[PDB]
Design a protein that fits this description.
Chain D: This is 116 kDa U5 small nuclear ribonucleoprotein component. Chain D: It is found in: Nucleus. Chain D: Belongs to the TRAFAC class translation factor GTPase superfamily. Classic translation factor GTPase family. EF-G/EF-2 subfamily. Chain D: It comes from Homo sapiens (Human). The structure is cut from a larger assembly and holds chains A (101 residues), B (78 residues), C (500 residues), D (43 residues), E (409 residues) and F (320 residues). Chain A folds into two domains: 50 residues, no CATH class; 51 residues, no CATH class. Chain A has six helices and no strands. In chain A, 30% of the residues are buried. Chain B is an all-alpha fold and 78 residues long. Chain B contains three helices and no strands. In chain C, strand 5 and strand 6 form a beta hairpin. The radius of gyration of chain C is 29 Å and the shape is globular. Helices cover 0% and strands 50% of the residues of chain F. In chain F, the strands form seven sheets. A four-stranded antiparallel β-sheet of chain F has the order 1-28-27-26, with no helix packed on it. In chain F, strands 2-3-4-5 form a four-stranded antiparallel β-sheet, with no helix packed on it. Chain F is mostly beta strands and 320 residues long. Classes of the chains: A mainly alpha (101), B mainly alpha (78), C alpha/beta (500), D little secondary structure (43), E alpha+beta (409), F mainly beta (320). Chains in contact: A-B, A-C, A-E, B-C, B-E, B-F, C-D, C-E, C-F, D-E, D-F, E-F. Chains C and E meet through helix 2, helix 3, helix 4, helix 5 and helix 16 of C and helix 4 and helix 6 of E. Strand 1 of chain D pairs parallel with strand 1 of chain F, so a sheet runs across the interface.
């Protein structure tokens, strides 16, 4: 179900060896993880191109503008800002709370 | 024509009795000289121009947004 | 020598394409080349073809341009051979000529890849080439829906409180649908065993499940990817969507709740079918009764005409705009629920090695998709009718009409449209024109589309199932009246939202 | 503007790329049945 | 052979190609019977009340044509325009029952009958009566009245043998007008959305061909080179005196460029010779002093440049240290004697040409036998490139570029 | 250096015909100039009208790419070969395949008919050529000796009766009755893909990516080297007036003067609307029997027709 520490380590190494089109081979290494869960974990969180840094001022401005533009469409928005859609979503909610004060 | 017709007629068509079946179980021409223009050796520049990168396979191992969206979204807020 | 038979067809194609590419490599490479590197060029050919099938852009940075031009040439040749074979094996499958099941599996596979290449292009063009619904057409659609809901005195649906008295009944219904999908099968997938596990866990403690659903509806706005497959019905293919189980329980609960509150609050007027009260053959029976009981319906002594056109709203699911869909759902439900529904349509779709974001149409395999279609179809009905004729058809909101009936006889005769029905995508309209109204329409139609050679009989299509006495007689007046009625209805509907 | 997805054209026209002095023929269908021979014998 | 699968064959069959893929369809009937009944106006397609005919022969109702002529000068049947005066009134006789008949022959008019009108008088007869009476009996009087008509006048009515944005937007309500007005008064161009919107090539054609999410590209869209000039000369100002080096820049251009470039930016200032061996080459060029440090101008390790006419023969040969093939870095050494073993293992890029006494003084410094590190520091204080071939080449290149622009503005 | 070459007017494109769905690989004109026949990677054989450029008919028997077509002069037959190892005889009175030939091991690459005797000669990727009786469908001979795929084959009445060029870059001149090689010509460095026989000059030219070479019958004596077309050339066609056409694999035609080896025109044609610039290429060309028009079968799936330009004079276009 949830992702342990050691499971993430196995998943990173296995993607580094087998690439990104063989999730059935990668699922065989883990315990009780299916191929779809492995893929989802990689793109959501474990991929190195995911940027886990603080938000710049520019990146926030684009967030607020695009969220006005296409409301609730975070998969469309998210590659324009270059964050994960979940990241974009929670940071939007952060700024909305902050503007409420 | 006559010779090849004879050949094809033969192809399609001690005393030996008709009943017996067949009995036995079932270098080229000398090399012609290579008559060639003298070869031109390859330059290092153009030899670099035929360098082929290795194949890195995704399978084997071994966004621009039109401005009218703004207009549409703006209209709906109004 | 052995012939090329059906076993050997594909392998022989690869065998010959391989040899021809090899010949051009030899004639292309300069004299006295240090290395041949032929096997690597053929590896790049394979990778190019595999990237074509996955719709993944192929670039190799170092590669010389004679070699790249040759590779793009031969990949395009193989693509044409592949796609033409897909084209005529589908025709054979539909006509019944094939009986082999592996060729049906191969064609289904080829067809899926071609569909996703096209659909991925459609999404890209939607983002680049702008929304197709103009600001004017969108504001007119929105404002019309507001006036409709305002005149019917509709009270909008609230968010379900956690102390809502009906929520375990709605949960029990939702779980029975979800469990019924798995009723008979043995040794299911891992995801299906996961889904049965979640259903049994929600049977055990419903309050936990209900708390999770309410928290999802309040806060979740970025979802997991759905898989797509096709059900081959031999004459066409039907998309089948695979949604994650957690999300699916939340959607099924929302689906039950929305239909219950919309039925209680009278959102959908009675022309919207399928209704719960009648099976479809009773609907057919009702229509005949409805037609027979219009006033003076079969009299033609003065030159009146009846017209009955059955058509479909073409591509209505695909042309839904999710921005305008959000603004139109907000008129009917708590904005939190509207955000959840609209955001839920925005997912990555993935079959095999290919995946793309859906950003334009709806995903029809969601649990609440039926609601969206009916509600969005309601807006299209208000375009085809007027607000005025639709108010006459639905009746005053204190005493509403039932299906195909009117408050008065004068009310039914006041307008040419007498009967209207919208069974999902399909529509059936019954018109009664006098001779003046018919002459008016035919003159407007013949102004726009002048026909000197009288070829209108050629396109017109009628029922070849009946005998010749029973088919439509294609008389000049009647062929032009039918085309004029259809043209007028077609002018009602903006091409960006749907068409006939 | 605005052109719908089924309306849009990706490539230029044939007489745009070849010019006015070139005649372009597109033959999607043929003008004879198979029943009618190409070399018909005299009867 | 057995013709076992004849519908599903390895190719498209003949019948299948005819029926679906562009074979010739028989196409038998075309508009076989499409005639309006005689009693109907041609414009309205409904039964006329006041018949009028055009000289050509088209018959249709007055009440429909007259507004039509006012709106459009022309007649519906033809492109040509028609002046309303030319319309000739038609009068159709009735039976006792009320049907249209020929006045003289009494035959009831049908969609199959042949119907003829006389222009001057306007009456309408079956063609039989007109023929049998007037064409045979050579009188041209009308049958009902004695009015005489010419043959031009006879006409056949029936012979069976033959933009804005608020376009698209009727009925705009108050909220729509007000919204579109505020929208145009307020809306301004978007900024973020607008921003969003060699032997080898850029890969725009291959990528656009292989993925349909990229816009169709049909036409292909396709580094700097530095060459050593003359002789490179560098003085190493060491704490043991000055060593002059000749660099073989024409032969080893990358290695010479690295060296001179490194020297010009003071890279070797203060660096030591960290490795010195009796009857072996002295080595330095490591700004870390550790024996394993240093870095090239490019960033990583660059290629060897072995040459058949450069060997480690004689004293004072200048070569690169490395960690294996094509990994030169910064480190370099000077030989104390011939050493053929070094050939094709270390790039030779120059030789000592002055300060041989200094090289000897360097050699004579004792080194720690365990580490080969000199016991008293041997140090490069400064490096002077007194002939820099690479610098001259760069200046020439800039001039050439300017000339090209002038030729093709 | 050479005499002054004869003046030939330029040719211009005047008609583009587009109906196939794969590469047009071969083209041939009927003896009476009424129609021509093209074979395709589409696997269809199409019969077009030569005057109007209209599609008369399509024939669909083949299993893979149709690689060569030829029309019989002495009987109402059409012969086609393909990459599906199969050679068919089509009866144009019935529009039906009436007979077929078997024994080839791989893809058949081209075929030709002997102009007096009724034999068919086909060349193939198993590095053989075969001589077939037209009637009784029997290999009378298999010409063997090339070490890689035989790419082209030509026939004449005079000796030698069969010329085969190959992917092992050699030309071979064969005895038809014995089935042996007489002469082997090894002057090319890359593979010989096209050979053309002069109508009345008793010479022949062969093409390779190197350069075109021009040779003399019966012994194969080398005459001349025609150089300048630096591309893989797929077809050579010679006119009766002495025009030579070389169509390349990258889509360029070079017109040449046969007499002197003078290259007087270079033509590069645009591709059709849908295609890539890499899709341009010429797989076949043929003059009609009138020799007024030139037909090229191409890799952007079009047939292009060239016409000789009548307004141009020696003064307008000089011979350099």
């Amino acid at each position: 179900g949830v992702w342990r520490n050691t499971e993430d380590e196995i998943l990173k190494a296995a993607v580094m060896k087998y690439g990104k089109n063989q999730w059935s081979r990668i699922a065989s290494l883990l315990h009780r993880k299916s191929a779809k869960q492995c893929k989802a974990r990689w793109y959501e969180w474990l991929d190195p191109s995911i940027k886990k840094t603080e938000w710049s001022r520019e990146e926030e401005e684009k967030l607020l503008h695009l969220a006005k533009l296409m409301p609730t469409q975070w998969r469309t928005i998210a590659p324009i800002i270059g964050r994960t859609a979940a990241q974009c979503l929670e940071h939007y909610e952060f700024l909305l709370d902050k503007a409420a004060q | 024509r006559v010779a090849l017709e004879k050949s094809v007629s033969q192809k399609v068509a001690m005393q030996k009795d008709p009943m017996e079946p067949p009995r036995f179980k079932i270098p080229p021409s000398p090399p012609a000289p290579v008559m060639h223009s003298p070869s031109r050796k390859m330059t290092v520049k153009e030899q670099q121009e035929w360098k082929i990168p290795p194949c890195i396979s995704n399978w084997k191992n071994a966004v621009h947004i039109n401005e009218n969206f703004a207009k549409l979204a703006e209209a709906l807020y109004i | 020598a052995k012939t090329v038979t059906k076993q050997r067809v594909e392998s022989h194609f690869d065998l010959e394409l391989r040899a021809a590419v090899m010949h051009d490599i030899l004639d292309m490479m300069p004299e006295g080349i240090k290395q041949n590197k032929a096997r690597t060029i053929l590896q790049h050919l394979s990778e190019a073809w595999r990237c074509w099938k996955a719709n993944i852009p192929w670039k190799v940075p170092g590669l010389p341009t004679p070699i790249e031009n040759m590779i793009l040439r031969y990949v395009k040749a193989k693509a044409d051979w592949w796609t033409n074979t897909a084209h005529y094996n589908r025709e054979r499958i539909r006509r019944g000529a094939t009986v082999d099941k592996t060729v049906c599996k191969k064609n289904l596979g080829r067809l899926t890849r071609l569909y996703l290449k096209a659909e991925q292009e459609r999404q890209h063009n939607y983002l680049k080439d702008g929304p197709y619904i103009t600001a004017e057409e969108a504001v007119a659609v929105y404002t019309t829906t507001v006036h409709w809901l305002e005149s019917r005195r509709f009270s909008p649906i609230p968010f379900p409180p956690l102390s809502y008295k009906h929520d375990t009944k709605l949960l029990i219904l939702a779980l029975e649908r979800l469990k019924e999908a798995y009723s008979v099968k043995s040794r299911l997938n891992q995801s299906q065993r996961e889904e049965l596990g979640l259903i049994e866990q929600a049977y055990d403690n419903p309050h936990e499940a209900l708390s999770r659903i309410k928290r999802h509806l309040l806060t979740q706005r970025a979802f997991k990817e759905v898989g797509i497959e096709f059900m081959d019905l031999y004459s066409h293919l039907v998309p089948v969507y695979d949604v994650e189980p957690l999300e699916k329980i939340t959607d099924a609960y929302l689906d039950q709740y929305l239909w219950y509150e919309a039925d209680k609050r009278r959102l959908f007027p009675p022309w919207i079918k399928p209704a719960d009260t009648e099976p479809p053959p009773l609907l057919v029976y009702k229509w005949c009764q409805g037609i027979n009981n219009l006033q003076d319906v079969w009299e033609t002594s003065e030159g009146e005409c009846n017209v009955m056109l059955e058509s479909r709203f073409e591509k209505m699911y695909e042309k839904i705009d999710l921005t305008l869909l959000n603004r139109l759902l907000r008129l009917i439900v708590d904005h939190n629920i509207a955000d959840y529904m609209t955001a839920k349509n925005n997912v990555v779709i993935n079959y095999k090695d290919m995946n793309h974001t859906n950003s334009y149409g709806i995903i029809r395999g969601l649990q609440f998709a039926s609601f969206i279609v009916q509600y969005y179809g309601l807006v299209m009905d208000l375009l085809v009718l007027g607000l005025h004729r639709a108010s006459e058809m639905a009746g005053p909101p204190q005493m509403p009409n039932d299906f195909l009936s009117f408050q008065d006889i004068a009310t039914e005769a006041a307008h040419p449209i007498r009967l209207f029905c919208r069974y999902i995508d399909r529509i059936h309209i019954f018109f009664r024109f006098t001779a003046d109204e018919a002459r008016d329409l035919i003159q407007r139609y013949l102004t726009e589309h002048p026909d000197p050679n009288n070829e209108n009989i050629v396109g017109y299509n009628n029922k070849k199932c009946w005998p010749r006495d029973a088919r439509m007689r294609l008389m000049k007046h009647d062929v032009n009246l039918g085309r004029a009625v259809f043209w007028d209805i077609k002018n009602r509907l903006p091409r960006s939202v749907t068409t006939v | 503007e605005v052109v719908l997805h089924e309306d849009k054209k990706y490539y230029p026209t044939a007489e745009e790329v070849y010019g006015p002095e070139v005649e372009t023929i597109v033959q999607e269908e043929d003008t004879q049945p198979l029943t009618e021979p190409i070399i018909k014998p005299v009867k | 052979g057995k013709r076992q699968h004849q519908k599903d064959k390895m190719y498209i069959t003949c019948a299948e190609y005819t029926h679906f893929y562009g074979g010739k369809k028989p196409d038998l009937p075309q508009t076989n019977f499409r005639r309006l009944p005689f009693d109907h106006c041609s414009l309205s397609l409904q039964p006329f009340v006041y018949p009028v005919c055009t000289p050509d022969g088209i018959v249709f109702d007055l009440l429909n044509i007259v507004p039509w002529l006012k709106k459009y000068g022309t007649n519906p049947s033809n492109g040509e325009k028609l002046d309303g005066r030319s319309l000739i009134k038609l009068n159709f006789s009735k039976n006792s029952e009320g049907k249209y008949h020929c006045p003289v022959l009494f035959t009831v008019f049908t969609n199959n009958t042949h119907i003829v009108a006389v222009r001057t008088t306007g009456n309408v007869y079956a063609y039989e009566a007109v023929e049998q009476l007037n064409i045979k009996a050579k009188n041209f009087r009308d049958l009902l009245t004695d009015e005489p008509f010419s043959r031009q006048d006879i006409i056949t009515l029936q012979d069976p043998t033959n933009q804005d944005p608020s376009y698209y937007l009727k009925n705009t309500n108050a909220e729509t007008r007000e919204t579109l007005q505020e929208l145009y008064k307020e809306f301004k161009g978007d900024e973020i959305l607008a921003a969003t919107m060699a032997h080898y090539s850029t890969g725009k054609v291959s990528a656009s061909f292989t993925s349909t999410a990229m816009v169709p590209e049909t036409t292909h869209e396709a580094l700097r080179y530095q060459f050593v000039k003359k002789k490179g000369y560098v003085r190493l100002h060491t704490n043991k005196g000055d060593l002059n080096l000749e660099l073989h820049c024409d032969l080893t251009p990358k290695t010479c460029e690295n060296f001179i470039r490194l020297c010009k930016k003071h890279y070797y200032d203060g660096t030591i010779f960290h490795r010195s061996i009796r009857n072996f080459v002295i080595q330095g060029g490591d700004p870390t002093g550790t024996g394993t440090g240093g870095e090239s101008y490019w960033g990583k390790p660059f290629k060897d440049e072995f040459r058949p006419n450069l060997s480690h023969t004689g004293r004072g040969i200048l070569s690169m240290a490395n960690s294996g093939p094509n990994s030169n870095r910064s480190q370099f050494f000077i030989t104390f004697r011939s050493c053929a073993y070094l050939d094709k293992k270390h790039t030779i890029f120059g030789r000592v040409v002055g300060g041989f006494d200094v090289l000897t003084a360097m050699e004579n410094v004792e080194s720690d036998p365990k580490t080969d590190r000199p016991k008293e520091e041997i140090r490069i204080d400064a490096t002077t490139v007194f002939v820099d071939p690479y610098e001259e080449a760069d200046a020439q290149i800039a001039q050439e570029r300017k000339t090209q622009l002038k030729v093709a503005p | 250096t050479m005499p002054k070459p004869q003046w030939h007017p330029p040719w211009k494109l005047y008609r583009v015909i587009s109906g196939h769905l794969g590469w047009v690989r071969c083209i041939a004109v009927e003896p009476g100039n009424q129609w021509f026949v093209t074979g395709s990677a589409d696997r269809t054989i199409k019969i077009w009208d030569l005057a109007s450029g209209k599609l008369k008919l399509s024939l669909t028997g083949h299993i893979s790419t149709v690689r060569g077509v030829i029309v019989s002069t002495r009987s109402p037959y059409l012969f086609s070969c393909g990459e599906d190892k199969q050679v068919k005889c089509w009866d144009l009175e019935y529009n039906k395949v009436i007979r077929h030939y078997h024994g080839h091991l791989s893809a058949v690459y081209g075929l030709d008919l002997h102009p007096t005797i009724d034999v068919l000669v086909t060349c193939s990727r198993d590095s053989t050529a075969r001589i077939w009786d037209v009637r009784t469908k029997a290999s009378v001979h298999t010409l063997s000796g090339h070490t890689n795929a035989v790419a082209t084959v030509r026939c004449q009445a005079a000796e030698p009766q069969i010329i085969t060029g190959s992917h092992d870059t050699t030309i071979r001149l064969w005895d038809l009755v014995a089935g042996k090689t007489r002469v082997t010509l090894t002057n090319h460095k890359k593979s010989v893909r096209a050979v053309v026989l002069h109508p009345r000059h008793y010479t022949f030219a062969s093409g390779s990516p190197d350069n075109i070479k021009q040779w003399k019958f019966p012994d194969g004596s080398f005459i001349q080297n025609l150089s300048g077309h630096n591309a893989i050339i797929n077809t050579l066609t010679v006119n009766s007036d002495g025009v030579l056409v070389s169509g390349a694999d990258n889509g360029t035609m070079h017109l040449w003067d046969w007499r002197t080896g003078y290259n007087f025109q270079r033509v590069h044609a645009a591709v059709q609307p849908g295609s890539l610039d890499s899709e341009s290429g010429i797989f076949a060309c043929a003059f009609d029997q009138s020799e007024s028009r030139l037909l090229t079968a191409e890799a952007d799936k079009t047939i292009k027709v060239y016409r000789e330009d009548d307004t141009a004079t020696e003064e307008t276009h000089p011979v350099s």
